[PDB]
């Protein structure tokens, strides 16, 4: 016989902060010879990018 006002809240995340780190400075830092060594190891850094 009577009406009651109702309201409920919902929470839904959408996106996070995207990150991009270069593999050479992440692993070997500033070592040029380490970069030369990982050049022939594979294309893993391209896959990560």
């Amino acid at each position: 016989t009577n009406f009651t006002i109702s309201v409920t809240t919902e929470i839904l995340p959408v996106s996070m902060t995207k990150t991009s780190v270069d593999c050479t400075m992440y692993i070997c830092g500033d070592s040029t010879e380490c970069s030369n060594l990982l050049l022939q190891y594979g294309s893993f850094c391209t896959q990560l990018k």
Binding site: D22, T24, M25, D30
Partner: protein, 50 residues
């Protein structure tokens, strides 16, 4: 494509220079030395690496 470095200044040479008197001369030049089973132990520091 790539990344650009930070260019961290120019190479800094530190300042460790002290009196150059070291006990290497009197321990390397001697007419008699210790034996293998009992060797003399000397702590050499507070000078430069000759």
């Amino acid at each position: 494509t790539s990344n650009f470095r930070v260019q961290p200044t120019e190479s800094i040479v530190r300042f460790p220079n002290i009196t150059n008197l070291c006990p290497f001369d009197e321990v390397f030049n001697a007419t008699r030395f210790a034996s293998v089973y009992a060797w003399n132990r000397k702590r050499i520091s507070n000078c430069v690496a000759d």
